[PDB]
Write a protein that binds this DNA or RNA. Structure first.
Ligand SMILES: [Ca+2]
Ligand SMILES: [Ca+2]
Ligand SMILES: [Zn+2]
Ligand SMILES: [Zn+2]
Ligand SMILES: [Zn+2]
Ligand SMILES: [Zn+2]
Ligand SMILES: [Zn+2]
Lengths: 512, 131
RNA sequence: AAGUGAUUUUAAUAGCUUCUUAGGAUGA
RNA sequence: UUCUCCUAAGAAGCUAUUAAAAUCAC
């Protein structure tokens, strides 16, 4: 084709430009071009007043330079930066008067649910310098995008909506990760619309700090991280993934609604950005826990996991030593790690699938309520971090409550959420219908450790022979308070414990 | 709809100096990484017998220069970004430039790195005989 | 009066291969 | 009669260009 739609002059002027003040060769009009090289003719002079809108459509970031880090990344290093995905969809208008044949971004929306409404502007070519000014627009003809009609009147100038962005990314991505990975679907008009708020360059460092520099500023030419980016115009070096090149055929609204059904005004500029990453999140994380991909430590990662292992080692021992279960089932643990090794029950590992080892004879079984409603009737089944639709009547469930939002619990597919803590767990939607056969778990602490010889604590929730008496010992007060800290910190983290109907806390007392 | 003005050979180096904080230094380094310099420039059919200066309103070159289209050589007028010199005006756009044919394969890299001498009127170094 | 591309079908044209036909000349 | 070459014609293909027709994404 020998041409490109990049920087294609979009004016409606018939004639071309002078030899000088012509960008390239294809732009000099046929009055000058003779024998593959232009010639000057004094019969007609160069122009002095004119403006030719420029179509910034069809950018190709396939470059590579020795220092310059590339934007477009491939899934396996996009799946490692899952705390820093920001859907991006820009919906745009056209050019109408004295300028035709180009689009230019009008509404921008990210996955934070943030529609910003810029004004139709575009780089016009004065005879001195390539400007940046308003050009008369025309909303896209049709009806499926009808909401764009009353919106071309209520916008902001760009330099006022370049700072709304950096003050929005640096609120979400401030305390999750140190970069931004726009998860964009088209890849087309989403790079025409990044010329206006993205710079790139060699990987520089935050001024006044040491994190990586991911913001710019044309006032004080200096960079910043997300924290020290107050009043900064441009994003620095954003990476970006293209989702429909992972192999999806068809539009978005009919390629997303195949899985999720709770994302919905699908033609606005920010619900087409939440569908853009609810579809990248889903088919990249939904069906596996890679295990192999470790994640950095944002905060409380050690303490939350330690509290979870403590409470899990606690409740299962309490239930076993209380109800004298003959056998205990297990579902969903990758290896064979016995939580209470000093027990009498037979740990049959009904794992979902064999994971990298066969040393302990782990069984393979998937669980569904209508399938296995009457298969397990003996003992108790430990559904720790299982994802089944409904749990049986004898179980000890710990399911992550997905309605709690934190820097750990990223939003996910189908109402479920992505809990990225040293690993990526895609827990599904937390519904009350799953716990019709179970009840909540009271707080308690039970230990068989003998009492050894400060504020006196009187709580009936603690089960020790010392607190059963008049005086509570200092060999159980600190244990009780540390267990309370672990329990409350985990509950605030978002897990939710469930237990079978017949769980009686009094049955533990007669063991003593 | 709309006249096209860019060929696919430049489509990957204009779309990389477009997004760049300082597209001067970000194009010097593009050539060093085995890339190919900007093409499709404007070349004038002058007579090769003229007073060769850096910038002149009419194509005037020696037997070893080659008068180009000024704008074509200003990298900024070639990726349509802002000019860095005060008030944002191009000293090239509108006035013919004459490049030594030793480097006339990529003028866009010549004007970015050389400099016009003020009183000699010629390319400082490539004819600036200020002894 | 004329939004952006991507791949499709045919027609028009050029370049080249092979095959066939005819012509010319060389040599047995 | 055979060989080579050239000229032209007819065929099919290849790539290149031009036009319209359709589809998909946006
Ligand atoms: Ca898009
Ligand atoms: Ca959209
Ligand atoms: Zn910093
Ligand atoms: Zn969804
Ligand atoms: Zn004690
Ligand atoms: Zn210039
Ligand atoms: Zn001098």
């Amino acid at each position: 084709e020998n041409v490109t739609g990049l920087f294609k002059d979009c004016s409606k002027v018939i004639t071309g430009l002078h030899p000088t003040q012509a960008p390239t060769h294809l732009s000099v009009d046929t009055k000058f071009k003779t024998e593959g090289l232009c010639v000057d003719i004094p019969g007609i002079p160069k122009d002095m007043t004119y403006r030719r809108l420029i179509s910034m459509m069809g950018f190709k970031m396939n470059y590579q330079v020795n220092g310059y880090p590339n934007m477009f990344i491939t899934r396996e290093e996009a799946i490692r930066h899952v705390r820093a995905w920001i859907g991006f969809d820009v919906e745009g208008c056209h050019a109408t008067r004295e300028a035709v044949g180009t689009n230019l971004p009008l509404q921008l929306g990210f996955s934070t649910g943030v529609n910003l409404v810029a004004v139709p502007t575009g780089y016009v070519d004065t005879p001195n310098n390539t400007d940046f000014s308003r050009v008369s627009a025309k909303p896209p003809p049709g009806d499926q995008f009808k909401h764009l009609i009353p919106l071309m009147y209520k916008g902001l100038p760009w330099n006022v909506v370049r700072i709304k962005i950096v003050q929005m990314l640096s609120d979400t991505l401030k305390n999750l990760s140190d970069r931004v990975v726009f998860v964009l679907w088209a890849h087309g008009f989403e790079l025409t619309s990044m010329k206006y708020f993205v710079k790139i360059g060699p990987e520089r460092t935050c001024c006044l700090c040491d994190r990586r520099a991911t913001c710019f500023s044309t006032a004080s030419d200096t960079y910043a991280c997300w924290h020290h980016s107050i009043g900064f115009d441009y994003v620095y070096n954003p990476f970006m993934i293209d989702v429909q090149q992972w192999g999806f055929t068809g539009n978005l609204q009919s390629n997303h609604d195949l899985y999720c059904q709770v994302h919905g005004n699908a033609h606005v500029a920010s619900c087409d950005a939440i569908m853009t990453r609810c579809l990248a999140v889903h088919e990249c994380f939904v069906k596996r826990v890679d295990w192999t991909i470790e994640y950095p430590i944002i905060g409380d990662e050690l303490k939350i996991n330690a509290a979870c292992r403590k409470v899990q080692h606690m409740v299962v021992k309490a239930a076993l030593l209380a109800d004298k279960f003959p056998v205990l089932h297990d579902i969903g643990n990758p290896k064979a790690i016995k939580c209470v090794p000093q027990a009498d029950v037979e740990w049959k590992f009904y794992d979902a699938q064999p994971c990298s080892d066969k040393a302990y004879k782990i069984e393979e079984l998937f669980y569904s309520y209508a399938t296995h409603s009457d298969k397990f009737t003996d003992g108790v089944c430990l559904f720790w971090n299982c994802n089944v639709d409904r749990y049986p009547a004898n179980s000890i469930v710990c399911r992550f409550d997905t309605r709690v939002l934190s820097n750990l619990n990223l939003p996910g597919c189908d109402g479920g959420s992505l809990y990225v803590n040293k690993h990526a767990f895609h827990t599904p939607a937390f519904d009350k219908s799953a716990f019709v056969n179970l009840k909540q778990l009271p707080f308690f602490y039970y230990s068989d450790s003998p009492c050894e010889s400060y504020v006196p604590l009187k709580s009936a929730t603690c089960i020790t022979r010392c607190n059963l008496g008049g005086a509570v010992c200092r060999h159980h007060a600190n244990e009780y308070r540390l267990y309370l800290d672990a329990y409350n910190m985990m509950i605030s983290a978002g897990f939710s414990l469930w237990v079978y109907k017949q769980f009686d806390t009094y049955n533990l007392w007669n063991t003593f | 709809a709309g006249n096209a003005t860019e060929v696919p050979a430049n489509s990957t180096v204009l779309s990389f100096c477009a997004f760049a904080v300082d597209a001067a230094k970000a194009y010097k380094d593009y050539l060093a990484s085995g890339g190919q310099p900007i093409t499709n420039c404007v070349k004038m059919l002058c007579t090769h017998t003229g007073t060769g200066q850096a910038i002149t309103v009419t194509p005037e070159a020696n037997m070893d220069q080659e008068s180009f289209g000024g704008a074509s050589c200003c990298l900024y007028c070639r990726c349509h970004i802002d000019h860095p010199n005060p008030k944002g005006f191009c000293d090239l756009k509108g006035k013919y430039v004459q490049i030594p044919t030793t480097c006339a394969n990529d003028p866009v890299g010549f004007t970015l790195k050389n400099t016009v001498c003020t009183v000699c009127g010629m390319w400082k170094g490539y004819g600036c005989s200020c002894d």
